[PDB]
Amino acid sequence: HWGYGKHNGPEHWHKDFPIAKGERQSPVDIDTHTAKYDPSLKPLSVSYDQATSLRILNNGHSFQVTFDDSQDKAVLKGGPLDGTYRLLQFHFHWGSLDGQGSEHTVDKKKYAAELHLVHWNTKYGDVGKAVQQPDGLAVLGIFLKVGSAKPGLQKVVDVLDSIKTEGKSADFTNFDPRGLLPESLDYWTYPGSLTTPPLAECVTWIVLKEPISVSSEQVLKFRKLNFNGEGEPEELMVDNWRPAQPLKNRQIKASFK
């Protein structure tokens, strides 16, 4: 089964998921001087006021917080998107050291971590159908740099000791994802894929220009999670990121000059 190690990591994934060598794979390097400002791009509309978080889970490749997506409670609209996209979950990718961990890069710069807020297009009825469509998902990506603490992250950080190993989950109600957003919603956008298997080419990526700052203590708690299940030899959950993939016949657009 796939992972991030020497023998099952990103360079091997194409054997079980041949789309890994496809025409619209993610992540990519964002060359800021080559991205084109698109004045027809609308501001992002993030409506998270009624979000209902449910659970937090260690799935063996990251940890994720899941939301009730059975109604339009937390939705993303506008920007490059047509229609309404419901928030399903968020998760992170991070490194073993502060100089790596993000999936997207900016002028080849890697951030310490990357937050992905995953949304699906309500016209397709459920996320399983949406993943089969070229415009099925919208992922909002937010970079994390290490500096001052992010208060809105602390409730996540403080529960991680209860989901140390693969398969563990915990109740995680009343979490407000608005506390994870930077001040500015300026963004880059391009058509891409899931960054983990099945690597489906169904994602409109929206990557925010402004990172959030988290403290060294906060990211250190991410690095104490385990890839392995309970009772197995311990392998710290670090460096769970896919490297940048070829841009091929794609242009990255910017919402800002």
Ligand SMILES: NS(=O)(=O)c1ccc(O)c(NC(=O)NCCCCO)c1
């Ligand atoms: N990192 S991402 O591009 O935001 C992303 C967003 C939503 C997703 O569903 C996945 N992929 C996933 O969760 N795979 C789980 C194992 C099942 C494969 O058989 C990746």
Ligand SMILES: [Zn+2]
């Ligand atoms: Zn992700």
